[PDB]
Amino acid sequence: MSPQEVDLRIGQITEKDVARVASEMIWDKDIAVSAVGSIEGLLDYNRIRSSISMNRW
């Protein structure tokens, strides 16, 4: 892709597209984790997942 095409594609981005993508991909969706080292303080899966969707709204 030419730099003109990249600039045009980036320019189209607005805040509502970001909101839509974050709502359809990140908001309350399954995650895959992987930990190595001293992970005694890392809580279990359900408590980790519960933080990916805020409850105030």
Add this chain to the structure above:
Amino acid sequence: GGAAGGKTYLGWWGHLGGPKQKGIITYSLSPFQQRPMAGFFKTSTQNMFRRVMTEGLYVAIPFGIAYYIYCWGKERNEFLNSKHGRH
């Protein structure tokens, strides 16, 4: 805060006061990917059968003896205060 608390055996997250572990890999799935009510009946039936066949007499013997002496005591006490019992 501080206050220099005492000595316990629980601690908290991060420092639980346990021996150092090494080379213990652990895998688990997501609750939304696994299926509840999968293999529940079979495993539960096998576990109940094994528990009944294993513990079993441990409870069976004392309760049976107690019930037998209960029945015998009731029968004898009813008989003795009747007409023929006192004679």
